[PDB]
Amino acid sequence: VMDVNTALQEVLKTALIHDGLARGIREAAKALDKRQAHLCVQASNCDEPMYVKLVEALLAEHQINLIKVDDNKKLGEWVGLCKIDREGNPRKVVGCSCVVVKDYGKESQAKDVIEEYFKCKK
RNA sequence: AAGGGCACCACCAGGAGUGGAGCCUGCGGCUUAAUUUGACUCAACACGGGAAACCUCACCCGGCCCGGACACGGACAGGAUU
Ligand SMILES: [Mg+2]
């Protein structure tokens, strides 16, 4: 399970240092409605059902992959949406709830989401 | 006070004048919301290279903008904000 979660860690890291990936609900909607977006990542600890039924029901009608992570806070720490000093707060913000990767930057570690799509089609 | 010398920003011998008139322009005063301000014997007053319609622009009457770095807290991708 390390070789998939750390894998999309590296994927979103190279995506955000190479370009801008959409962070937050409005940019996520406006980025995946356009027909270039790669997989979405969204949290599991959401407290309201219309938010989650919106995001899954609106990504499933597209042809885009989905990976679900348990907490939004630690995800937001992962997605670079913070002011991380190496001796202070890891995540001083309420973390992000859903992102979408517009571009990977390069094809170094695309095999992880390739086999992710394989087991999704399994 | 005396004794030497000197200068048309002194005089003499004169020339052209200015002071008088209309106008231009600079100062004071008066008036004004404001009539921005400096300079007042030579050594201020067509001077600030100052002939301002706007800008200049300081002054008056109104109305936008931040072009308030940075540091520390706060709030923040369920949205700081434009
Ligand atoms: Mg004389």
Curated annotation (Swiss-Prot):
Q: Residues bearing N6-succinyllysine?
A: K119
Cellular component, GO, one term? Golgi apparatus
Against Pfam families, the record matches this protein to: Ribosomal_L7Ae
Drop me one GO molecular function for this one. RNA binding
Cellular localisation:
Cytoplasm; Nucleus, Nucleolus
Q: Residues of the signal sequence? A: none
Q: Which family does it belong to?
A: Belongs to the eukaryotic ribosomal protein eS12 family.
Provide the protein name.
Small ribosomal subunit protein eS12
Lineage start: Eukaryota, Metazoa, Chordata, Craniata, Vertebrata
